[PDB]
C-alpha cells in the first residue's frame, strides 16, 4: 500500500487522534458524536479535558435510568436553544431510548455550536439507524510503543512536565516507557502476562500523580535533584503494591511487574548509555536518550523506528507470528467476504459410528491403606463412569439415528450439540482448555482412557511407585501430587509440612513440556523455539543461580498446579527468563 | 411543633383516636377484671377501628420523617416505624436503649439516673462502659436532634481525653524494661479495648521513631515488644474474665503485629525515619501540646495523613495484620488520599469485607456493610449515599456486581459527585445528590467488595470503575493468621499446631471428592479454630473441676472432626481420617458423652413414632447425624441439611428442636418457608416507586416479628428453615446475615440486627447452582441416602398402622 498510494498514507493513524478539529469543523450539529470503545478503555475523559481545553460546558448524563432519560431530555432541549454542549454515556443499555433520541435528533435542527457525544461499548445492541446516524469513533488501545508514548505526552499536559525539577522529564519518560511496555504486553497474551489486566489511562494518571508528589515531598523547590535522592524505592514499592500491582493475580505475573520496576527504575542512577531493551539480538540495542528537556524526549519518541518485534518488550521475537499469521488470513477473509457481494443425519450416523472405536472399555481395580492406591481407584473409577456414560449415549444417538428408538428431549439436545460440534454440557467432566472442540476432546478421551487402562494393568499386577505417569492425562493432577507426597511421608515417617520438591530430568512424570527454554543436564538455557518436550521428569520429596518456574494445566495457562525450581546456566539471566515468560504445561 | 398547621385533618383523625382511646382507658380502668373488661359488647370492633385510623394516621404522616432526618446527621440509619417510635418516646427515654445499635457504631445502650434527666455515659453490647468527663443534661429541656449531637460530641471528647490519659500512662510504663503484670492488668482494665490498642499503637510508633532518629535503640525497642510479649503470653495462660480475655487478645494480636514489623525493620539496615521502608508501615502520632482535643491524635502512612474519629466501636474483633492486610491498607489508604474509592476483589473468602471494616475501625470511622442485590435502585442508592454524606460514615457496598448495569451506571453520576465534592474538600461545603443539596463530611469513603464471575453477576461501567482503584486479593497468609490466633486464644505449641493445621486444610481441599458443598477456605479454617479455643476452654474447667499441660493436637483434632466430619459423604470419611492419621502421628479420637440428650431423643423418637439406634443399631446413622447437627447448632449459625430427597432430613431436625425443647425447657418455634413458592420480591419485601414505602416480605415480616418480640420471641428458641432449593437469585441476600456482621440490609436503608437466639437453616437438595459465597458461610450436614434405611420407614408405617386409628379399643 506504502509503494502505491506513498509512504505516508497511513502515517496518520498512528498519531495520536486530533478531535478538536475533527469535531469543530467535520461535525454537522445535528449528528452525534458517537464515541465507540472496547471494553476496559473508556473515552469520557478524552471529551472532559477537551471541553476543559475550549472552555465550553458539559452536562454529562450517564444514561440507564427515568430519571436519567428526563436529564437527557431537557440538557439536549437547552443546548439546542442555547448553543451548549450534551454529553450521554453509557447508551449502549437503552436502545429503546437511543431510537427516538436519532428520531428526535433529526427531527430538530439545532445552533450551530451544538455537539452532543454519545459513548458506548462496541455492541450489537446499538442501532443501525443511530450508527448511521452518528460520526463513528472507535477508542482502542494505541498499537505499538511508539504510538503509546506519543499518545501519553500527548495526554500529559507540558505545564506538568515542566514544573522544576530537571529530573521529572526523565521521570515522566520513564514512567511512560514502563507503561507502554506492560500495555504493549497485554496483546501477546499469556506469554506477556497470564491474564487480561485492564491496565488503563486510570493506572497512568495516579503513577503521574504519585511521582508528582513523591518529587514534590522530596525537593524543596529545588531546581535539580542528585539522580540518588530520588526516592526509586518508594516509586517502586507503591507502583508494585498499590497501583500497577493493584489487578496483579498470580505471584508469577507480580515477579514479572517486580522485574521490571527494579530494571527500570534505577537507570544507574541517570548514567547516559542505558539499555532500555535488546530490539535484536545480533548488535541491536535500544538507547536511553541523554537529553534533559521534555521537547527532547517528545523528539527521540517521534524517531523511533517503525518497525517493531516482540523483542522490544522483553518477548520473545516469535510471540507475534501466530498472531500475526492469524490477522493476515483473516485479513484474506474479509476480502473474500468483500468480492463475495460483487442427509447430513446420514454423515452425521457415519461420524458417530467413526468415533467409538478408539474407546472399548475400562476395568475397576478396594480396601487398601495406599493413598496411591486409592487414588487411582478413584481415578479409575471416575474414568470408567465417564466412559460408561459417553459410551451409552453413542448408541443411544446411534439408534435415534439409524435405528428404533424415538427422540428424546436429552437426546435432541445432544444432536444439536453434536451437530453443532461443541461440547455437550453433560461430558464436560474434567478441564478442557478454553472450549476445545468434540474432535480434539474424543482423542484426549482416548488417551486418558488408554493412560487408565494401562494404570489398570499395573495395579493387577511396591507395583505402583515403577510406573510412569503423564500429567496431562489425569483428572485431577495435584492429588496425585499430594498422593505422592503423602505416600514419601508414610514411608519414610516424616512430616507432611517439612516436604519440599527437587526436580530432575524418585516419582516419574512424564508429558511436562517447556515454554521457550530448553533443558541439558538439569541447566536451563534460553532458546527460541516454541516449546521442547521434556523426556522424562522426575520428582523426589526431601526435607531440605536457581529460577522458579510455574507448570500450567494448559497452553491458556488459567490452572496452576505446582511450582518447579530448575538451574540456570551460567550465561543467562533470571530476570531475562522471567521477563520472556518461560513457563512448564502438562498438556499440548 | 407545628403540627396542627401541616396536617389537618390527620390532626382532626388524632383528636378523634384520642377521645376513643380516653373513652377506652375510663371504661378499662372502671372495671379491672377481665371478665368484666370483656363484658362489653363491640371491643373487637373497636379495636378494629382503632387500629386501622391508627395505621392511616400512620401511613399519611411518614412525609415528617425526612424533615426529622435532616436535622440529626444519625437519623437516616432507621426506618420509618422505628423513627416514629423515637421520636413519640422521646420523654419515655429509657424506650430508646434498644434503637441506639443502628443510629451508633457500638453504643447499644446509654446510662442514665434515677432522675431520667441526665445521660451519664454510654454502654457497649459487651458490658463496657464509658464514663463521660461532663455529662449531658436533659434539665434544661432541649430537642432530641440538640441532646443527641451534644451526647455524640462529649463521647468524642471522652473518648479522646481517656486516650490521651492512656498514651501517658503507657508512656510511664514503656521507660522500663521490666514490667510489672499486676499494673498492666490493672491498666488494660482501666481501659477500654480500643483505647489499649490505640495506645500500645502509639507506644511503639514513638519508640521506634524515637530509635530511627539515632542498631541499639531498635534492638530495645524490639527486645522491650518480645518482654511485653512473653508476658502477654504467661497472662493469658492461666484463667482470665470474658471482656479482659479479649482486651489481652487484641493486645496480643496488635504486639506480634508490631514485633513482626520490628523484626523486618531490623533485618534491613535502616538509617533514617525517612526511608520507605518505615513510611510504608502505619504510624501513629501523638501531641499532647495540641489544644483541640479531638486532633491530638494523627494517623499516617505513605503521604496519606488521617486524623481519629473517635467513633465509639466496643470491643468487635482485630483481624490478623497479615502481609495482605497491609498490602490492602496500603492500596487504600493511598485511595482514600487521592480522594478515591476504594474496590478489593477476588474469590469469597478472602478477608475483603472485614479488612475494609478493621481499616474504618482503625482510622476510628464508623462503617456501614450493605449487600447490595439487583433491587438496589438510584432512589434507595441516592437515600443510603445522603445519609452517609450527613453522618461522615464508611460504605463497605458488598456484591456490588450484581446491581442492575443500568443502575450501575447511574449509581456511577452520583458516585463521581461525592468524589469531586470530595475534591473540592480537599483544596458550606455542599454537593447534589437526588436534585438536593447536601453537605458532606471530609470523613467520607466508599468501599466496593466484588466477586468477578460468580454466578454470571454484571459488570461495572469503564467510567465507574476509573473511579475505584482496584485491588486483587486471592492468597490470604493462612500460615501466619492461624499462628496469631492461636497464640492468642494461649497455646504452648501454637506455632506447630499451626503450621500443622495448614497444610492439613491444603491437602484436604484438593484430595477429597468434588462435591458442590465443600469449603475448606479462610471461614471454615477460622471456624475451626474458634471452636479449638471454646473447646479447650471448656476442656481446661471440666479438668479444674476436679496451671497443668493439656493435649493441645487432641483438642485440635477434636475441633476438626466436629466441624469438618458432617459434611463429608461416606466415602471421604476415612479419607480424611487417614490424612489426619498422617498429619498428626499420636492423633487419637474420642466422641459421646451426651447421654442426657441421647436418652431424651430416644424418648420423643418412641413418642413420635420413629425407630432409634444406640450408634451400631439400625438407627444408629440417623441419631449420630442428628448430634451432629445439634453439635453445629451449638457451634454455627447457618445451617444446611443437603442430602437426597429421602434422608430424614426433616424429622432429624424436628425431633432435634422437640428434644433441645425438653432439655433446656426453653420452647422452640420453627418456621417453614419456601422460597420458590413466592417470589424474591414477596419473599424480602418490595419498594414502591412512587412512594418510597417499603413493605415486609415473609423473611423480612418474620425477623421483624421476632426483634420486636410483642409475645416474648426473644426467651424462646427460633429457628427459621427455608424448605427449598438454592440458587444465588434470593440466597445471596443472605451473606450478610451469615456473615460476622449478622445482620439484614434493605433498599430503604434500615439495618436488622439478628438476635443470638435464631438460627437459619436451609434444607436444600442439591448444590448444583448455589456459589461459593454461600456454601462458604453454612455449616453442612451433609444426609446420605443410606442414612434413613427401609426397615425404618417400614417400622415407622408399622407403628402407624398401629396406633392412630383411620377414622379419627376401637374396631
Ligand atoms: N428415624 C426414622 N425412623 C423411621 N422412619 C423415619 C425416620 N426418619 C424419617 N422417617 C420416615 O421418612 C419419611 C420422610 O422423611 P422426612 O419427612 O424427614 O423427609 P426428608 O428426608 O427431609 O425429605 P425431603 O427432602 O424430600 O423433604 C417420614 O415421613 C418418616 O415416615
Ligand atoms: N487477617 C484476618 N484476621 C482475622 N480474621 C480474618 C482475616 N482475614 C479474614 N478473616 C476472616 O475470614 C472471613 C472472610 O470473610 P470475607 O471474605 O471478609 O467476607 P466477604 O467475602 O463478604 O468479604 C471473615 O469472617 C474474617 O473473620
Ligand atoms: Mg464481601
Ligand atoms: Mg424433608
Same mark, same amino acid.
Given at each position: 500500500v506504502?509503494?502505491?498510494? $506513498? ?10 487522534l ?40 458539559i452536562?454529562?448524563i450517564?444514561?440507564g435510568?427515568?430519571? $436519567?432519560?428526563?436529564?437527557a431530555?431537557?440538557?439536549?432541549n437547552?443546548?439546542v ?13 437503552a436502545?429503546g431510548?437511543l ?7 433529526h427531527?430538530?435542527?439545532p ?15 446499538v442501532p ?11 477508542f482502542?488501545?494505541?498499537p505499538?510503543?511508539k ?8 495526554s500529559?499536559?507540558?505545564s ?12 515522566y ?10 500495555q ?9 502476562w497470564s ?12 503513577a ?14 529545588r ?7 530520588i526516592?526509586?524505592? %518508594?516509586?517502586?514499592?507503591?507502583? %508494585? ?14 515477579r514479572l ?8 527504575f ?19 540495542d535500544?538507547?536511553?536518550?541523554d537529553?534533559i ?15 517493531? /518485534?516482540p ?14 499469521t ?6 484474506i ?5 468483500m468480492?463475495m ?9 457415519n461420524?458417530?459410528?467413526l ?9 475397576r ?14 481415578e479409575?473409577?471416575?474414568?470408567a463412569?465417564?466412559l460408561q456414560?459417553?459410551?451409552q ?36 467432566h474434567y478441564?478442557?482448555?478454553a ?8 482423542s ?17 499386577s ?7 505417569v ?13 498422593a ?5 511421608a508414610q514411608?519414610?515417617s516424616?512430616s ?9 530430568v524418585?516419582?516419574g512424570?512424564?508429558?511436562?513440556k ?6 541439558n543436564?538439569?541447566?536451563?538455557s534460553?532458546?527460541?523455539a ?8 522426575q520428582?523426589?520429596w ?17 490452572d496452576?498446579?505446582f511450582?518447579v525450581?530448575?538451574?540456570i546456566?551460567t550465561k ?7 521477563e520472556?515468560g518461560?513457563?512448564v504445561?502438562?498438556?499440548? | ?33 377481665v ?13 378494629e377501628?382503632?387500629?386501622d ?9 411518614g412525609e ?36 441506639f445499635?443502628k ?14 434527666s441526665v ?26 436532634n ?8 462529649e ?9 490521651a490519659?492512656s ?8 521507660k ?18 480500643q ?6 499503637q ?26 511485653t ?14 471482656l479482659?480475655?479479649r482486651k489481652?487478645?487484641?493486645?496480643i494480636?496488635?504486639?506480634?503485629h ?13 538509617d ?8 510504608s ?17 494523627s ?10 474519629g ?20 496500603? /492500596?487504600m /489508604? ?29 482510622l476510628?470511622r ?12 438510584f432512589?434507595?442508592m ?6 452517609l454524606?450527613?453522618?461522615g ?5 458488598d ?11 447511574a ?8 468524589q469531586?465534592?470530595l ?5 458550606p461545603? /455542599?454537593?447534589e445528590l ?32 476509573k ?5 486483587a ?15 492468642s486464644?494461649?497455646?504452648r ?13 491444603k491437602?484436604c481441599?484438593?484430595?477429597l471428592?468434588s462435591?458442590?458443598?465443600?469449603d ?15 473447646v ?10 476436679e ?5 493441645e ?9 466436629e466441624?469438618?466430619?458432617?459434611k463429608?459423604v ?7 481420617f ?6 498428626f502421628?499420636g ?33 444408629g ?5 442428628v448430634?451432629?447437627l445439634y453439635?453445629?447448632?451449638?457451634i454455627?449459625?447457618g445451617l444446611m441439611?443437603?442430602?437426597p ?15 433441645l425443647?425438653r432439655?433446656?425447657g ?17 419473599l ?5 416507586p412512587?412512594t418510597?414505602?417499603?413493605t415486609?416480605?415473609?423473611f ?9 418480640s410483642?409475645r416474648?420471641e ?8 427455608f ?15 451469615l456473615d460476622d456482621?449478622?445482620l439484614?440490609?434493605?433498599?430503604n ?9 435464631v ?19 453454612c455449616?453442612?450436614?451433609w444426609?446420605?441416602?443410606?442414612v434413613l ?17 383411620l ?5
Open positions: 506504502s509503494t502505491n498510494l $506513498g509512504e505516508s498514507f497511513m502515517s496518520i493513524m498512528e498519531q495520536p486530533d478531535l478538536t478539529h475533527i469535531v469543530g469543523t467535520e461535525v454537522k450539529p445535528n449528528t452525534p458524536v458517537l464515541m465507540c470503545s472496547v471494553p476496559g478503555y473508556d473515552a469520557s475523559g478524552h471529551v472532559e479535558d477537551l471541553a476543559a481545553e475550549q472552555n465550553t460546558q452536562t454529562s450517564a444514561i435510568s427515568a430519571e $436519567g432519560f428526563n436529564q431530555d431537557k440538557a439536549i437547552t443546548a436553544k442555547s448553543g451548549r454542549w450534551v454529553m450521554l454515556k453509557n447508551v449502549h443499555l436502545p431510548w431510537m427516538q433520541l436519532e428520531k428526535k435528533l427531527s430538530l435542527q445552533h450551530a455550536c451544538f455537539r452532543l457525544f454519545l459513548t458506548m461499548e462496541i455492541n450489537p445492541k443501525v439507524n443511530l450508527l448511521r446516524a452518528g460520526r463513528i469513533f472507535v482502542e488501545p494505541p505499538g510503543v504510538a503509546n508514548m506519543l499518545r501519553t505526552f500527548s500529559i499536559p507540558v506538568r512536565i515542566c514544573k522544576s525539577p530537571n529530573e521529572r522529564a526523565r521521570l519518560f520513564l514512567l511512560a516507557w514502563f507503561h507502554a511496555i506492560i504493549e504486553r497485554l496483546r501477546y497474551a499469556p506469554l506477556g491474564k487480561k489486566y485492564e491496565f488503563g489511562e486510570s493506572d497512568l494518571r495516579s503521574c500523580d504519585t511521582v508528582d508528589t513523591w518529587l514534590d515531598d522530596t525537593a524543596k523547590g531546581q535539580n535533584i542528585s539522580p540518588d535522592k526516592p526509586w524505592s %518508594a516509586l517502586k514499592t507503591l507502583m %508494585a503494591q498499590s497501583i500497577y500491582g493493584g489487578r496483579v493475580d498470580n505471584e508469577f505475573d507480580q511487574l517486580n522485574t521490571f520496576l527494579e530494571r527500570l534505577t537507570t544507574r542512577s541517570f548514567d547516559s548509555e542505558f539499555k532500555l531493551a535488546c530490539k535484536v539480538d545480533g548488535h541491536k535500544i538507547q536511553m536518550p537529553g528537556r521534555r521537547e527532547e524526549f517528545v523528539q527521540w519518541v517521534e524517531l523511533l523506528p517503525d518497525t517493531q /518485534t523483542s522490544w518488550l522483553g518477548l520473545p521475537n516469535n510471540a507475534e507470528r501466530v498472531l500475526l492469524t490477522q493476515g488470513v483473516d485479513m477473509s474479509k476480502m473474500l467476504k468480492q457481494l460483487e442427509t447430513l443425519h446420514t454423515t452425521a450416523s461420524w458417530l459410528h468415533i467409538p472405536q478408539t474407546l472399548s472399555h475400562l476395568k481395580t478396594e480396601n487398601i491403606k495406599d493413598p496411591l492406591f486409592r487414588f487411582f481407584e478413584r479409575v473409577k471416575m474414568g463412569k465417564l456414560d459417553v459410551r449415549d453413542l448408541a443411544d444417538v446411534v439408534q435415534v439415528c439409524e435405528g428404533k428408538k424415538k427422540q428424546t428431549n436429552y437426546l435432541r439436545t445432544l444432536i444439536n450439540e453434536l451437530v453443532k460440534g461443541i461440547l455437550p454440557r453433560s461430558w464436560s478441564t478442557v482448555p472450549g476445545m472442540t468434540v474432535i480434539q476432546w474424543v484426549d478421551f482416548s488417551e486418558r482412557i488408554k493412560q487408565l487402562q494401562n494404570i489398570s494393568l499395573a495395579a493387577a511396591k507395583e505402583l511407585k515403577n510406573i510412569h503423564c500429567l496431562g492425562g489425569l483428572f485431577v493432577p495435584e492429588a496425585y501430587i499430594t505422592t507426597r503423602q505416600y514419601v514411608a519414610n516424616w507432611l509440612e517439612e516436604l519440599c520438591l527437587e526436580v530432575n524418585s516419582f512424570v512424564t508429558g511436562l517447556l515454554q521457550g527454554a530448553t533443558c543436564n538439569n541447566k536451563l534460553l532458546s527460541n516454541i516449546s521442547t518436550a521434556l523426556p522424562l521428569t520428582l523426589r526431601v526435607k531440605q543461580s536457581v529460577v522458579t518456574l510455574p507448570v500450567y494445566l494448559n497452553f491458556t495457562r488459567a496452576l498446579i511450582t525450581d530448575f538451574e546456566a543467562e539471566d533470571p530476570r531475562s527468563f522471567y520472556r518461560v513457563a504445561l502438562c498438556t499440548e | 411543633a407545628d403540627i396542627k398547621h401541616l396536617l389537618p385533618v390527620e390532626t382532626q383523625r388524632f383528636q378523634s383516636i384520642s377521645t376513643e382511646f380516653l373513652a377506652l382507658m375510663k371504661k378499662v380502668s372502671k372495671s379491672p377484671l371478665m368484666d373488661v370483656l363484658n362489653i359488647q363491640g371491643v373487637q370492633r373497636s379495636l377501628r382503632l387500629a385510623l391508627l395505621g392511616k394516621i400512620q401511613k399519611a404522616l415528617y420523617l425526612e424533615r426529622e432526618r435532616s436535622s440529626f446527621p444519625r437519623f437516616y440509619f432507621v426506618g420509618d416505624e422505628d423513627l416514629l417510635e423515637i421520636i413519640g418516646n422521646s420523654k419515655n427515654v429509657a424506650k430508646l436503649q434498644k434503637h445499635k443510629m451508633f457504631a457500638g453504643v447499644s445502650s446509654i446510662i442514665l439516673n434515677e432522675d431520667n445521660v451519664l455515659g454510654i454502654s457497649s453490647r459487651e458490658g463496657e462502659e464509658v464514663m463521660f468527663k461532663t455529662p449531658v443534661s436533659i434539665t434544661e429541656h432541649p430537642k432530641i440538640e441532646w443527641l449531637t451534644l451526647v455524640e460530641k463521647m468524642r471528647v471522652t473518648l479522646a481525653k481517656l486516650l490519659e498514651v501517658t500512662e503507657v508512656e510511664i510504663f514503656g522500663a524494661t521490666s514490667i510489672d503484670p499486676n499494673t498492666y492488668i490493672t491498666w488494660i482494665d482501666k481501659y477500654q479495648a483505647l489499649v490498642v490505640l495506645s500500645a502509639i507506644a511503639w510508633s514513638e519508640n521506634v521513631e524515637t530509635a530511627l532518629s539515632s542498631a541499639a535503640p531498635l534492638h530495645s525497642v524490639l527486645s522491650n515488644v518480645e518482654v510479649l512473653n508476658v502477654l503470653a504467661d497472662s493469658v495462660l492461666m484463667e482470665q474474665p470474658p479482659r480475655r489481652l487478645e487484641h493486645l494480636t496488635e504486639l506480634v508490631q514485633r513482626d514489623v520490628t523484626r523486618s525493620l531490623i533485618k534491613s539496615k535502616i533514617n525515619a525517612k526511608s520507605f521502608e518505615w513510611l508501615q502505619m504510624r501513629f502520632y501523638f501531641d499532647p501540646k495540641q489544644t483541640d482535643v479531638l486532633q491530638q491524635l494517623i499516617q502512612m505513605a503521604n496519606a495523613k488521617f486524623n481519629y473517635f467513633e465509639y466501636l466496643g470491643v468487635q474483633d482485630k483481624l490478623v495484620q497479615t502481609p495482605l492486610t497491609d498490602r490492602c491498607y496500603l /492500596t /489508604t493511598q485511595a482514600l488520599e487521592a480522594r478515591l474509592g476504594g474496590s478489593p476483589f477476588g474469590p469469597a473468602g478472602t478477608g475483603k469485607t472485614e479488612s475494609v471494616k478493621a481499616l474504618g475501625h482503625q476510628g464508623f462503617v456501614l456493610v450493605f449487600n447490595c442485590d439487583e433491587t438496589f435502585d432512589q434507595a441516592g437515600r443510603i449515599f445522603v445519609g454524606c450527613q453522618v460514615a464508611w460504605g463497605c457496598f456484591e456490588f456486581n450484581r446491581l442492575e448495569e443500568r443502575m450501575l451506571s449509581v456511577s453520576q452520583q458516585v463521581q459527585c461525592i469531586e465534592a475534591r473540592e474538600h480537599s483544596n461545603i /455542599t454537593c437526588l436534585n438536593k443539596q447536601v453537605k458532606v463530611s471530609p470523613d467520607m469513603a466508599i468501599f466496593i467488595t466484588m466477586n468477578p464471575g460468580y454466578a454470571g453477576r454484571s459488570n461495572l461501567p469503564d467510567n465507574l470503575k473511579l475505584f482503584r482496584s485491588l486479593m486471592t492468597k490470604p497468609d493462612r500460615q501466619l493468621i492461624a499462628q496469631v490466633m492461636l497464640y486464644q494461649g497455646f505449641t501454637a506455632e506447630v499446631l499451626a503450621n500443622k493445621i495448614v497444610p492439613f486444610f491437602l481441599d484438593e484430595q471428592s462435591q458442590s458443598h465443600y475448606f477456605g479462610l471461614r471454615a479454617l477460622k471456624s475451626v479454630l474458634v471452636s479449638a479455643g471454646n479447650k476452654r471448656e476442656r481446661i474447667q471440666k479438668i479444674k473441676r496451671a497443668e499441660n493439656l493435649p493436637q487432641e483438642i485440635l483434632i477434636q475441633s476438626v472432626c466441624t469438618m466430619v458432617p463429608l461416606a466415602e471421604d470419611i476415612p479419607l480424611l487417614s490424612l489426619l492419621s498422617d498429619v502421628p492423633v487419637q479420637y474420642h466422641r459421646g458423652e451426651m447421654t442426657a440428650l441421647r436418652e431424651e431423643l430416644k424418648k420423643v423418637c418412641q413418642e413420635m413414632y420413629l425407630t432409634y439406634g444406640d450408634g451400631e443399631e439400625v438407627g446413622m440417623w441419631v449420630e447425624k448430634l451432629q453439635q453445629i447448632t451449638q454455627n449459625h441439611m443437603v442430602g430427597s429421602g434422608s430424614g432430613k426433616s424429622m432429624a431436625w424436628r425431633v432435634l428442636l422437640k428434644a425443647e432439655l433446656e426453653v420452647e422452640g418455634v420453627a418456621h417453614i418457608i419456601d422460597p420458590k413458592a413466592i417470589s424474591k420480591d414477596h424480602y419485601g418490595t419498594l414502591d412512587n418510597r414505602e417499603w415486609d416480605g415473609l423480612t415480616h418474620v425477623l421483624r416479628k421476632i426483634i420486636d410483642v416474648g426473644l426467651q424462646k428458641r427460633q429457628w427459621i428453615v424448605d427449598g432449593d438454592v440458587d444465588p437469585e434470593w440466597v445471596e441476600n443472605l451473606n450478610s446475615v456482621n449478622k439484614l440490609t434493605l433498599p436503608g434500615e439495618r436488622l440486627s439478628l438476635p443470638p437466639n438460627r437459619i437453616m436451609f434444607e436444600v437438595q442439591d448444590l448444583k447452582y448455589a456459589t461459593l459465597a454461600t456454601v462458604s458461610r455449616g453442612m450436614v444426609f446420605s441416602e443410606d434405611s427401609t426397615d425404618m420407614i417400614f417400622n415407622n408405617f408399622l407403628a402407624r398402622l398401629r396406633s392412630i386409628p377414622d379419627e379399643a376401637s374396631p
